[PDB]
Coordinates of C-alpha atoms in Angstrom, one line a residue:
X12 CA 196.1 55.9 -1.8
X13 CA 193.7 58.0 0.4
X14 CA 191.0 56.2 2.5
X15 CA 187.8 56.2 0.5
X16 CA 184.2 55.6 1.6
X17 CA 181.2 54.5 -0.5
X18 CA 177.9 56.4 0.2
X19 CA 174.4 56.9 -1.3
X20 CA 172.3 60.1 -0.5
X21 CA 168.6 59.9 0.2
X22 CA 166.2 62.3 -1.6
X23 CA 164.0 64.4 0.8
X24 CA 160.3 64.0 -0.3
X25 CA 157.8 66.7 1.0
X26 CA 155.2 64.9 3.1
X27 CA 157.1 61.6 3.4
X28 CA 158.1 60.3 6.9
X29 CA 161.8 59.9 7.6
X30 CA 162.2 57.3 10.3
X31 CA 164.8 56.2 12.9
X32 CA 164.4 54.2 16.2
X33 CA 164.1 57.5 18.0
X34 CA 161.8 59.7 15.9
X35 CA 159.8 60.3 12.7
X36 CA 160.5 63.5 10.8
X37 CA 158.0 64.8 8.1
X38 CA 159.1 67.8 6.1
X39 CA 155.9 69.6 5.1
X40 CA 157.1 72.8 3.5
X41 CA 160.3 74.3 2.1
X42 CA 160.3 78.0 1.0
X43 CA 162.1 81.3 0.9
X44 CA 160.6 83.8 3.4
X45 CA 161.2 87.4 4.5
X46 CA 159.1 86.7 7.7
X47 CA 158.9 83.3 9.5
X48 CA 155.5 83.3 11.1
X49 CA 154.2 80.8 13.6
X50 CA 151.3 78.5 12.6
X51 CA 149.2 79.6 15.6
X52 CA 149.1 83.4 16.4
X53 CA 145.9 84.1 18.4
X54 CA 147.4 86.9 20.6
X55 CA 150.9 88.2 21.2
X56 CA 153.3 86.0 19.1
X57 CA 156.9 85.7 18.3
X58 CA 158.0 85.8 14.7
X59 CA 161.4 86.0 12.8
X60 CA 161.5 88.9 10.2
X61 CA 164.5 88.8 7.8
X62 CA 167.0 91.7 8.2
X63 CA 167.3 94.1 5.2
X64 CA 169.2 92.3 2.3
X65 CA 168.7 88.9 3.9
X66 CA 166.2 86.0 3.3
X67 CA 165.3 82.9 5.3
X68 CA 165.0 79.4 4.0
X69 CA 162.1 78.1 6.1
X70 CA 161.8 74.4 6.5
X71 CA 158.6 73.4 8.3
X72 CA 158.5 69.9 9.8
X73 CA 156.6 67.6 12.2
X74 CA 158.6 65.6 14.7
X75 CA 157.1 62.6 16.4
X76 CA 159.1 61.2 19.4
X77 CA 158.7 57.4 19.3
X78 CA 160.9 56.7 22.4
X79 CA 159.7 56.0 26.0
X80 CA 161.8 59.0 27.1
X81 CA 161.4 62.8 26.4
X82 CA 163.0 64.2 23.2
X83 CA 164.8 67.6 23.6
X84 CA 164.2 69.9 20.6
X85 CA 167.9 70.8 20.7
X86 CA 168.6 67.2 19.5
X87 CA 166.9 67.7 16.1
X88 CA 168.4 68.3 12.6
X89 CA 171.0 70.9 11.5
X90 CA 170.2 71.6 7.9
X91 CA 172.9 73.1 5.6
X92 CA 172.0 75.2 2.6
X93 CA 174.8 74.8 0.0
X94 CA 174.4 77.7 -2.4
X95 CA 176.1 77.9 -5.9
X96 CA 178.6 75.1 -5.1
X97 CA 180.2 76.0 -1.8
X98 CA 178.5 79.1 -0.2
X99 CA 177.1 77.4 3.0
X100 CA 174.6 78.5 5.6
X101 CA 173.3 76.4 8.5
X102 CA 169.9 76.3 10.2
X103 CA 168.6 77.1 13.7
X104 CA 165.6 75.3 15.2
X105 CA 162.5 77.1 16.5
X106 CA 159.5 75.3 17.9
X107 CA 155.7 75.8 17.2
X108 CA 153.9 77.0 20.3
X109 CA 150.1 77.2 20.8
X110 CA 150.4 80.2 23.1
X111 CA 153.4 82.3 22.1
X112 CA 153.6 81.4 18.4
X113 CA 157.2 80.0 18.8
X114 CA 159.8 79.1 21.5
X115 CA 163.5 78.4 21.0
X116 CA 164.7 74.7 20.8
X117 CA 166.7 74.7 24.1
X118 CA 163.8 75.1 26.6
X119 CA 161.4 72.6 24.8
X120 CA 160.9 68.8 24.7
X121 CA 158.6 66.3 23.0
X122 CA 156.8 63.8 25.2
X123 CA 156.9 60.0 24.3
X124 CA 154.6 59.5 21.2
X125 CA 153.8 63.3 20.9
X126 CA 154.1 65.1 17.5
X127 CA 155.4 68.7 17.6
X128 CA 155.8 71.2 14.8
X129 CA 159.3 72.8 14.3
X130 CA 160.9 75.2 11.8
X131 CA 164.5 74.9 10.6
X132 CA 165.4 78.4 9.5
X133 CA 168.5 79.4 7.5
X134 CA 169.6 83.1 7.3
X135 CA 171.0 83.8 3.8
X136 CA 171.9 86.8 1.7
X137 CA 169.0 87.7 -0.6
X138 CA 170.7 86.5 -3.8
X139 CA 170.3 82.9 -2.6
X140 CA 166.5 83.4 -3.3
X141 CA 166.7 85.9 -6.3
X142 CA 169.5 84.4 -8.4
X143 CA 169.2 81.4 -10.8
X144 CA 172.1 79.7 -9.0
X145 CA 171.5 76.3 -7.3
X146 CA 170.5 75.6 -3.6
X147 CA 171.0 72.2 -2.2
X148 CA 169.7 71.5 1.3
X149 CA 171.3 68.5 3.2
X150 CA 171.4 67.0 6.7
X151 CA 172.7 63.8 8.3
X152 CA 170.0 61.8 10.2
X153 CA 170.5 58.4 11.8
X154 CA 173.6 57.5 9.7
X155 CA 172.3 58.7 6.3
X156 CA 172.7 61.9 4.3
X157 CA 169.4 63.5 3.1
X158 CA 169.4 66.0 0.1
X159 CA 166.9 68.4 -1.3
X160 CA 167.4 70.4 -4.5
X161 CA 165.6 73.7 -3.7
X162 CA 166.7 75.3 -7.0

């Protein structure tokens, strides 16, 4: 008999805090996008336009570091989009910046008790948006699986 495990997935609720002993994650927006634009774009800004025939899944979140030590933005979620039962695409993290629009996750950190905006972006073929076929988002955070039925 193979080794089985018993598990229960948690539903992602937009605007609801997800908490661990290290951080608080609030997912504020989940949408398809052909151009991932930063929240603040006062002068020259970085943005992520989708390549022809592609679409982004743009997941916007607030991350509050609740530790006494700095939190690296490379240590955040990896979100998987599971399209039409098995066609899988994984996210990249970008960080909101008041000066340059965005920065990459590798050069940025969150101070103790600071909240920073981030984007988890998933590069998909365009049919992930335009078909009627399902999209399930998921991630593992602090020992639990989180799921979101996008369509």
